[PDB]
Design an enzyme around this catalytic site. Structure first.
Site, PDB file in Angstrom:
ATOM      1  CB  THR A   1       7.884  -2.613 -10.616  1.00 63.42           C
ATOM      2  OG1 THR A   1       8.353  -3.614 -11.523  1.00 63.42           O
ATOM      3  CG2 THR A   1       6.502  -2.170 -11.035  1.00 63.42           C
TER       4      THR A   1
ATOM      5  CD  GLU B   1      -5.277  -3.910  -9.617  1.00 64.12           C
ATOM      6  OE1 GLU B   1      -5.118  -2.674  -9.580  1.00 64.12           O
ATOM      7  OE2 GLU B   1      -4.380  -4.707  -9.955  1.00 64.12           O
TER       8      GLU B   1
ATOM      9  CD  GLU C   1       9.287 -36.496   4.572  1.00 67.94           C
ATOM     10  OE1 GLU C   1       8.344 -36.847   5.307  1.00 67.94           O
ATOM     11  OE2 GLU C   1      10.484 -36.647   4.871  1.00 67.94           O
TER      12      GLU C   1
ATOM     13  N   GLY D   1       1.111  -3.512  -2.570  1.00 71.63           N
ATOM     14  CA  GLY D   1       0.419  -3.180  -1.315  1.00 71.63           C
ATOM     15  C   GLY D   1      -0.587  -4.225  -0.886  1.00 71.63           C
ATOM     16  CB  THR D   2      -3.636  -5.588  -2.474  1.00 69.51           C
ATOM     17  OG1 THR D   2      -4.720  -6.374  -1.980  1.00 69.51           O
ATOM     18  CG2 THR D   2      -3.201  -6.108  -3.826  1.00 69.51           C
TER      19      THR D   2
ATOM     20  CG  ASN E   1       2.415 -15.598 -15.196  1.00 71.58           C
ATOM     21  OD1 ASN E   1       3.315 -15.215 -14.448  1.00 71.58           O
ATOM     22  ND2 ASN E   1       1.398 -14.827 -15.540  1.00 71.58           N
TER      23      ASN E   1
ATOM     24  CD  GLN F   1      -1.612  -6.301 -12.142  1.00 73.38           C
ATOM     25  OE1 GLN F   1      -2.449  -5.955 -12.973  1.00 73.38           O
ATOM     26  NE2 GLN F   1      -0.756  -5.448 -11.601  1.00 73.38           N
TER      27      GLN F   1
ATOM     28  CG  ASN G   1       9.026 -11.174 -12.040  1.00 73.19           C
ATOM     29  OD1 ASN G   1       8.670 -12.318 -11.764  1.00 73.19           O
ATOM     30  ND2 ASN G   1       8.229 -10.129 -11.918  1.00 73.19           N
TER      31      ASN G   1
HETATM   32  N1  LIG Z   1       6.071 -13.177 -12.476  1.00 72.71           N
HETATM   33  C1  LIG Z   1       5.147 -12.204 -12.462  1.00 72.71           C
HETATM   34  N2  LIG Z   1       5.391 -11.057 -11.795  1.00 72.71           N
HETATM   35  C2  LIG Z   1       4.420 -10.113 -11.808  1.00 72.71           C
HETATM   36  C3  LIG Z   1       3.237 -10.267 -12.455  1.00 72.71           C
HETATM   37  N3  LIG Z   1       2.464  -9.137 -12.297  1.00 72.71           N
HETATM   38  C4  LIG Z   1       3.173  -8.314 -11.543  1.00 72.71           C
HETATM   39  N4  LIG Z   1       4.392  -8.859 -11.215  1.00 72.71           N
HETATM   40  C5  LIG Z   1       5.452  -8.240 -10.421  1.00 72.71           C
HETATM   41  O1  LIG Z   1       5.020  -8.008  -9.097  1.00 72.71           O
HETATM   42  C6  LIG Z   1       5.349  -6.658  -8.705  1.00 72.71           C
HETATM   43  C7  LIG Z   1       4.101  -5.829  -8.723  1.00 72.71           C
HETATM   44  O2  LIG Z   1       3.204  -6.383  -7.770  1.00 72.71           O
HETATM   45  P1  LIG Z   1       1.624  -6.329  -8.039  1.00 72.71           P
HETATM   46  O3  LIG Z   1       1.074  -7.717  -8.052  1.00 72.71           O
HETATM   47  O4  LIG Z   1       1.302  -5.544  -9.275  1.00 72.71           O
HETATM   48  O5  LIG Z   1       1.079  -5.569  -6.732  1.00 72.71           O
HETATM   49  P2  LIG Z   1      -0.452  -5.725  -6.292  1.00 72.71           P
HETATM   50  O6  LIG Z   1      -0.613  -7.058  -5.644  1.00 72.71           O
HETATM   51  O7  LIG Z   1      -1.328  -5.505  -7.488  1.00 72.71           O
HETATM   52  O8  LIG Z   1      -0.640  -4.542  -5.218  1.00 72.71           O
HETATM   53  P3  LIG Z   1      -1.454  -3.183  -5.560  1.00 72.71           P
HETATM   54  O9  LIG Z   1      -0.689  -2.420  -6.605  1.00 72.71           O
HETATM   55  O10 LIG Z   1      -1.588  -2.369  -4.306  1.00 72.71           O
HETATM   56  O11 LIG Z   1      -2.810  -3.592  -6.078  1.00 72.71           O
HETATM   57  C8  LIG Z   1       6.376  -6.186  -9.720  1.00 72.71           C
HETATM   58  O12 LIG Z   1       7.676  -6.598  -9.343  1.00 72.71           O
HETATM   59  C9  LIG Z   1       5.932  -6.911 -10.981  1.00 72.71           C
HETATM   60  O13 LIG Z   1       7.044  -7.111 -11.817  1.00 72.71           O
HETATM   61  C10 LIG Z   1       2.972 -11.458 -13.151  1.00 72.71           C
HETATM   62  O14 LIG Z   1       1.931 -11.669 -13.747  1.00 72.71           O
HETATM   63  N5  LIG Z   1       3.972 -12.429 -13.130  1.00 72.71           N
HETATM   64 MG   LIG Z   2      -2.915  -4.258  -7.973  1.00 71.73          MG
END
Ligand SMILES: Nc1nc2c(ncn2[C@@H]2O[C@H](COP(=O)(O)OP(=O)(O)OP(=O)(O)O)[C@@H](O)[C@H]2O)c(=O)[nH]1
Ligand SMILES: [Mg+2]
Ligand SMILES: Nc1nc2c(ncn2[C@@H]2O[C@H](COP(=O)(O)OP(=O)(O)OP(=O)(O)O)[C@@H](O)[C@H]2O)c(=O)[nH]1
Ligand SMILES: Nc1nc2c(ncn2[C@@H]2O[C@H](COP(=O)(O)OP(=O)(O)O)[C@@H](O)[C@H]2O)c(=O)[nH]1
Ligand SMILES: Nc1nc2c(ncn2[C@@H]2O[C@H](COP(=O)(O)OP(=O)(O)O)[C@@H](O)[C@H]2O)c(=O)[nH]1
Ligand SMILES: [Mg+2]
Ligand SMILES: [Zn+2]
Lengths: 173, 442, 430, 430, 442
Positions: free
Chosen positions: E178, E70, E253, E143-144, E227, E10, E205
């Protein structure tokens, strides 16, 4: 072509070779780990080892919403230059001849410290010891290091500000 | 060349408004810092650099920080006329005041706010190439000015080292008073200031009220008049760095000439042509007349009489149309006077400065326009009388521990009261010993 | 025979600007640097003070040193400032603080190498080098400390040339600086060992010249620096113009100094007279001699009547007879015989040069070696002892690093100089 | 008598572009390759740097080598890029990564045969071959590794010619790369055996040239590479124009190198001067000589005052008399006698060429052999010993395959070189 | 020349959306995949090639894959504004998430999707002629991102060889959180990532929220702001491959200069001119000011304080109107400071890069427009505190077997917890020993 050249420069070459080659011997394992001999007396991240000659940071919540971060300082270093290098200025630099610390000759031309306010900015309690910024490596009138010390094998030894050890205990009847 | 100004608390910020008003109008920077739409540079010359820096687009911004624990005064600066001149980071404000407690400013709250102030001052000091000192404005009677001013001067003294620190300080007047706890804060401030200041100039509002009643014609003066006079004094002392002159005086020369021993750094200040517009056209104002004026106690901005002590050093700054021969004749006549006495170990008692730029006139001001002025800062043993009266009032209150529980609650050991009181007693004995004749001790 | 000039500190840089204006005027050099003179006599000795630029231009052989560029910035902005070579301005980033120890030991050692590099670059270019000329005040901080430091280094590097200094010294009535006795004593200690000849001027004497003799209504520092530039340019006149009896800096030293420590001299310039009174009296050798010995025209507060002349020198500029000069010097020596040291049969040297300064028919500069200078050193030693017994401001100097033994050595050396002058004043043949 | 140039790595290709611009300008070659010069004197020696193509075109005797084509694509796109022969660009497919072992052993051996084929094709075309000239940095990766590999191969294949190198070396104050000590030590070990004469440049020294002498407000790498192009084109100027006292690369080597290991030299170029100053000083042989020996005008961090000159050479361009050149070189040797090795009776060779570079009345390039270069090698050896004791970053080099004995041999050989310089500095006749 | 970007999960896909928005606007490719009407074969226009490839009809398509389990985020990309820019094959989506389980992603679900990802990356790598590395975006907290990121990096490391892998990673914030199971996923991810990555850049973050509150004037920031900052940093680091400059830096490098020992590959990142348009008009933005900015911990995008450790190497990237003398003067000024310390075995601590292209401005952005910027990636021993704080939370949770039945049920042996925890203990000991002075080691 190199007969007389090598014959005339012999003794100095052997002297320098006998000096340098023991230093080139490795003292660290290939994984970045120390050998079984000559272990350090203390671990690196200890308060007195990490801040032996540098003030520890101060943290405060002002200006932050989450876990606070410290700030940089303007404390300069000693005005030392490599031996045999021209006075180089790419532009106008801030020399360290000025900003000479006020602890220089304080106990002789003045009466020394006469208040407990030295603990606010000059004396620090690092872990189990005490650090004092006025009791480090000796400097001259132009903010230059006076003494240089070496180990048995010839490694430069840095200065230390740690003056004393504090025997802290909790109170009881 | 450059100098950085630090303004602390209420008196320091309000005096800062008058100072920056004067420095802008004297150099010619507009109150918003912009320039007319057709010019490429707002001014032809770099002389402003001592107090202002210009961006590559030519906007001007000043080399100052404003420090306060209550927001109101800084919020007044943010919403006033000079909103565009200052960088918003320079105007720092906390949530709540130090409540007239030195302990609250020094231990609990200023300790939290001090690191932001040091980071801002460092950001200013990194944008400099010949910094030659800090100027500090504060009052020692209030809690945040005393506590945070002392703590910040201690940290500055460790970080910057040899660089000079000159203080303009408002001390508690000898009979006019505003708060009950003034003696405790003033004693503890003076204890910290002894070790960590190179020259301290002392001001009392009762003297500036007397000066505004006798010389100016103001029946109902207010702090803006006093602050404009203080701004004029600071402009006179710093003029030697900014304009052409016969005898310049760098800020490092004051500490070398005025301080004989490391604790003896408290000086008296006076200004000569403080005069109203109606009196100014009835009198000529020659060099000898204003030189005779600076030694009369009616001209001083601190309530002390120098006839009850001995001078150790005097520094006389002349600005405007003055000729050196008249300055020499005037100083020799002053030296002739019998109510002016120098310690016998100080034969060469004077330092002189001569600058060509006459004092500036401010649109709403109350001073007349004059071609020349002289300002003096001097070290004298008469200052011992001010400390004796503060120490007696401290002793009266401390005999019954009248208010100590506030200070102990805000973080301070009771021992600190007694320690400061013996240090000020020793300063009194120092002023007795330094004044002893060498011919008497054989 | 080339001179190298060094200007140090605020006083030195300010006097130097007026000196180079006077010299550029006398040789007809435009402020752009172009030669625009009207006689070959001006061009034939231009090398003595100027270096040659290619087309028309000439550049002046001077080094300017100061710790803060403010004074140099004032002189560069002046009307003749452009003539100076940009590479000859050496400056630091923090002031001397009016302190001798800082100027000699801390910022001195930081800048001195660049000053020595410039002085060597200027000296080694000459085909034959004459002495150096230095202007500085003794009461200041960078002037006293770096001037004496540089003098010591140049005496190590050029011991066979001449070392000449023009120095400003504290008035007896009003001080311009509180710590004047320390800076003066240490500087005199350095000069008496290193220097060959030193001239001393009191600002009080220049104020009295301007107000009483010239009756100027509104004098300025430009007038005092013009009087100094006039005498300084007069001493060198025989080096750079023809004359009936040539003279030289070394010849002046040989005739003026009886013993190597007695090399401190008084200065005077004679034809000072107000524009209103000029009509009443014309210019003649008796008139110049009368003004020349009149204490009104002498640039120090001490008066000759309290001492005795060991030696004196007079340099005359203008077209005049040698008979009048010789008979005037004999008549003055015979009529005032008690004020001249008797074991020297003739105390005055004369010299005559054909070319006067523009607008004057004749002029003379007077150099005198008189024992009344002992009163100044005695006064400075008294004020030094008053301050030192009480450690009045000593912590600044000791904090920079000086040993107190330096102060006791400098006091002892000056006290011996005063004793030596007093003994030679009252000596007799027996 | 024609020279073949080799440019290796980013620094080498960028300096080479400016060099070929300067040479094309001096011989009046348009960037299209057409001759547009204005004197036959330009054409009669054009062969020295250019080969002749059939129609109206000229081609430059240069080989360009790099491991990633980014720099080559930037220079080929430049305003003079078209002149270069397309077949002379040799490149791989992945960078050296600033690692000596990768640049020397993996991609080096892959490209070296194609580079040697191009160098042999260019060499065997010459009617008489003079030495090779190579530009590269020692701190990089492909520059150090492939440059030293190619130098070793050319010394095996052409042992009777001259081998000359221009090399960039790490500044004493700020590093441009973290692993500079290893690459520098291994490269210096290779060069001291293979090279006949090597010149070393610090970028920090060029920054000091730009800030102090030219006072440029915003210098760019084009200015630094122009200063380098000026000295490199100046050393060979007497090879390709007439003159009163001819000189040659082999004759320079014979006069400069006393013993085969002592072949590291400093360089300088004199008529450097700021836009404001030119009105203040006309050109003359004393002015050029004074700038020639001023350490401000020397392109290395080591200062001559800590060492001694064994030998030096000066090549003068312009119409001038031999008497002033000879007497200036004698006067500089006599006045600074402590800085010249006493067991050699004359350390300076002079040479004079009639044709100066356009727009300058006169010019000189200076080459110096001074023992103060030992302190730079000592500093690099110290940092190498600090890194090796802790095996700093060693796994990259060991992973490519190098034996640690190579590191210990190179360190020992360089340490013996510093000892040899120190012994000859303090040698005496006895 | 070419580089391939892999976006996972995500955070990685949303940051990819911001990055490709930026890369399109900087090169000039329109959202429909078309060069502007003024560009033709008239002039040489190839800078896009590092990130885009052109089809025979002249449409541009980017060298990236987006990976998610997802559908929602990739369906948002498919239905968003850039629908026509991406090839539909590049957007790969599964049916259901890894539910914050690293075990579910690695063992159960990612093993089905992984072969499609390797086939797509191979199809991209066959259409290249100078691929020089992979850039990977993922979060180790989910997880993913953890499970499929580790599995995919392992497979890439087996198929490809001698190719750099640079990671930009979002680690769990030290007090903002989170999910409850963050320590387990972060430990197991870092255990797999340790062996198969050349340099790892860390982001938090909580730090970037503090930076957006402190530097920008945003009271309620959201992930799009974060982002955009990440997109600017990646654009700054990759600019050296795409535009003219004085000192270029290839991706190989970085690994040579920043990694002293093969396990010590975690680096801090910071960006200097993070400033709002209203502040931008109060300040000049010279090289030395932004160089001073990159060293303050308030500028960092990871919540760690470098004052608790020692620096081993720093890499400084300057882009825009900068002159080498100013870069040298700035780096020389930083080296003088006493609160910045380097290990004594690393004397030559700096690597420099200088590029001429200034940073591009995005229409709805919050950063000001500036002529120059500097970006830093640095290796420091302070990172041991980040692992130590994750390990303490792991020890607290594992002491009670708080959630292990989920991990054991989805296919993983319980032994893997002990192995990973022992590897992180050894990494902590490496960071303790490497910081020990050589003089004490004899
Ligand atoms: N900087 C930033 N952090 C993000 C973003 N989206 C989620 N996070 C952070 O990443 C963590 C959540 O990880 P996710 O990316 O949602 O996990 P996932 O890869 O979707 O894994 P699954 O839930 O199993 O599908 C939390 O600490 C969120 O604050 C984003 O768009 N930008
Ligand atoms: Mg996810
Ligand atoms: N001359 C002058 N004196 C002032 C001014 N403002 C306040 N004072 C005096 O300074 C003292 C009060 O100090 P304050 O500045 O109010 O104290 P503070 O810094 O606000 O400290 P806190 O009350 O804890 O916030 C009194 O003696 C006032 O008379 C001013 O503008 N000018
Ligand atoms: N005649 C003369 N005296 C000066 C001049 N400038 C300063 N002085 C005197 O020199 C002394 C001050 O020394 P100064 O030059 O300031 O020392 P510095 O600070 O080291 O440069 C005082 O006695 C001043 O009166 C000047 O232009 N002319
Ligand atoms: N004087 C100069 N130095 C350069 C130039 N380009 C790079 N350098 C320096 O050379 C070193 C980098 O070596 P480099 O050429 O990149 O090595 P390579 O990767 O093997 O080609 C650094 O010290 C740079 O500062 C240039 O055009 N001129
Ligand atoms: Mg208040
Ligand atoms: Zn305190």
């Amino acid at each position: 072509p190199n007969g007389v050249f090598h014959k005339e420069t012999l003794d100095c070459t052997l002297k320098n070779r006998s000096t340098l080659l023991p230093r080139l011997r490795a003292i660290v394992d290939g994984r970045g780990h120390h050998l079984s001999g000559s272990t350090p007396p203390a671990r690196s991240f200890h308060p007195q080892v990490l801040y032996k000659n540098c003030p520890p940071p101060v943290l405060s919540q002002a200006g932050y919403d989450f876990t606070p971060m410290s700030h940089n300082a303007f404390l300069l270093r000693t005005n030392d230059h490599p031996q045999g290098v021209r006075d180089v200025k790419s532009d106008f630099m801030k020399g360290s001849c000025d900003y000479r610390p006020r602890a220089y000759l304080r106990d002789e031309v003045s009466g020394g410290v006469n208040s407990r306010h030295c603990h606010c900015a000059e004396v620090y309690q690092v872990g189990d010891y005490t650090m004092d910024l006025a009791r480090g490596a000796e400097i001259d009138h132009r903010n230059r290091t006076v003494n240089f010390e070496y180990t048995k094998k010839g490694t430069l030894k840095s200065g230390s500000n740690i003056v004393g050890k504090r025997h802290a205990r909790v109170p009881r009847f | 060349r450059e100098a950085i100004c630090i303004h602390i608390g209420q008196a320091g910020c309000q005096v800062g408004n008058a100072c920056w008003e004067l420095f802008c109008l004297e150099h010619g920077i507009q109150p918003d810092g912009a320039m007319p739409s057709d010019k490429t540079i707002g001014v032809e010359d770099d002389a402003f650099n001592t107090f202002f820096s210009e961006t590559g687009a030519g906007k001007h911004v000043p080399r100052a920080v404003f420090l306060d624990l209550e927001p109101t005064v800084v919020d007044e600066v943010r919403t006033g006329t000079y909103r565009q001149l200052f960088h918003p980071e320079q105007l720092i404000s906390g949530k709540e005041d130090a409540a007239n407690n030195y302990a609250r400013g020094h231990y609990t709250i200023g300790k939290e706010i001090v690191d932001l102030c040091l980071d801002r001052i460092r950001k200013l000091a990194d944008n400099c190439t010949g910094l030659q000192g800090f100027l500090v404005y504060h009052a020692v009677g209030g809690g945040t000015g005393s506590g945070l001013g002392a703590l910040l001067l201690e940290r500055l003294s460790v970080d910057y080292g040899k660089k000079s620190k000159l203080g303009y300080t408002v001390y508690p007047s000898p009979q006019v008073s505003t708060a009950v706890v003034e003696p405790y804060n003033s004693v503890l401030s003076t204890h910290s200031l002894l070790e960590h200041t190179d020259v301290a100039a002392m001001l009392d509002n009762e003297a500036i009220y007397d000066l505004t009643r006798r010389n100016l014609d103001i029946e109902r003066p207010t702090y803006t008049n006093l602050n404009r006079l203080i701004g004029q004094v600071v402009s006179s002392l710093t003029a030697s760095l900014r304009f052409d002159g016969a005898l310049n005086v760098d800020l490092t020369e004051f500490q070398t000439n005025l301080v004989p021993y490391p604790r003896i750094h408290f000086v008296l200040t006076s200004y000569a042509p403080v005069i109203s517009a109606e009196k100014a056209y009835h009198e000529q104002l020659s060099v000898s007349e204003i030189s005779n004026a600076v030694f009369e106690p009616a001209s001083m901005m601190t309530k002390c009489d120098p006839r009850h002590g001995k001078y150790m050093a005097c520094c006389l700054m002349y600005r405007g149309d003055v000729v050196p021969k008249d300055v020499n004749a005037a100083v020799a006549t002053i030296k002739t006077k019998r109510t002016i006495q120098f310690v016998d170990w100080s034969p060469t008692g004077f330092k002189c400065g001569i600058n060509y730029q006459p004092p500036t006139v401010v649109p709403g001001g109350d001073l007349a326009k004059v071609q020349r002025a002289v300002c003096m800062i001097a070290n004298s043993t008469a200052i011992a009388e001010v400390f004796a009266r503060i120490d007696h009032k401290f002793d009266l209150m401390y005999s019954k521990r009248a208010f100590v529980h506030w200070y102990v609650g805000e973080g301070m050991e009771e021992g600190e009261f007694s320690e400061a009181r013996e240090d000020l007693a020793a300063l009194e004995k120092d002023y007795e010993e330094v004044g002893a004749e060498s011919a008497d001790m054989d | 025979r080339e001179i190298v000039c060094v200007q140090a500190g605020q006083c030195g840089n300010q006097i130097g600007s007026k000196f180079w204006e006077v010299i550029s005027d006398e040789h007809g050099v435009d402020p752009t640097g172009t030669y625009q003179g009207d006689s070959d006599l001006q061009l034939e000795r231009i090398n003595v003070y100027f270096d040659e630029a290619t087309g028309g231009r000439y550049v002046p052989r001077s080094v300017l040193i100061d710790l803060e560029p403010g004074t140099m910035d004032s002189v560069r902005a002046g009307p003749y400032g452009q003539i100076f070579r940009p590479d000859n301005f050496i400056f630091g980033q923090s002031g001397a603080g009016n302190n001798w120890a800082k100027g000699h030991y801390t910022e001195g050692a930081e800048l001195i190498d660049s000053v020595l590099d410039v002085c060597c670059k200027e000296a080694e270019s000459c085909d034959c080098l004459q002495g150096f000329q230095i202007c500085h005040s003794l009461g200041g901080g960078t002037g006293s400390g770096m001037g004496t430091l540089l003098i010591s280094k140049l005496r190590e590097q050029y011991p066979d040339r001449i070392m000449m200094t023009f120095s400003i010294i504290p008035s007896p009535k009003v001080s311009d600086t509180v710590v004047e006795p320390y800076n003066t004593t240490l500087s005199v200690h350095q000069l008496v060992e290193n220097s060959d000849e030193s001239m001393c001027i009191d600002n009080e004497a220049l104020y009295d010249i301007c107000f009483r003799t010239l009756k100027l209504t509104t004098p300025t520092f430009g007038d005092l620096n013009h009087l100094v530039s006039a005498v300084v340019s007069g001493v060198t006149c025989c080096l750079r113009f023809p004359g009936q009896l040539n003279s030289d800096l070394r010849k002046l030293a040989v005739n003026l100094v009886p013993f190597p420590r007695l090399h401190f001299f008084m200065m005077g310039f004679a034809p000072l007279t107000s524009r209103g009174s000029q009509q009443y009296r014309g210019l003649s050798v008796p008139e110049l001699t009368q003004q020349m010995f009149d204490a009104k025209n002498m640039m120090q507060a001490a008066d000759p009547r309290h001492g005795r002349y060991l030696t004196a020198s007079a340099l005359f500029r203008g077209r005049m007879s040698t008979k009048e000069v010789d008979e005037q010097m004999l008549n003055v020596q015979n009529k005032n015989s008690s004020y001249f040291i008797e074991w020297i049969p003739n105390n005055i040297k004369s010299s005559v040069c054909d070319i006067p300064p523009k607008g004057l028919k004749m002029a003379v500069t007077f150099i005198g070696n008189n024992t009344c200078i002992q009163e100044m050193f005695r006064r400075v030693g008294e004020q030094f002892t008053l301050m030192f017994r009480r450690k009045a401001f000593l912590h600044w100097y000791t904090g920079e690093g000086m040993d107190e033994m330096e102060f006791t050595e400098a006091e002892s050396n000056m006290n011996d100089l005063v004793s030596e002058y007093q003994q030679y004043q009252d000596a007799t043949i027996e």
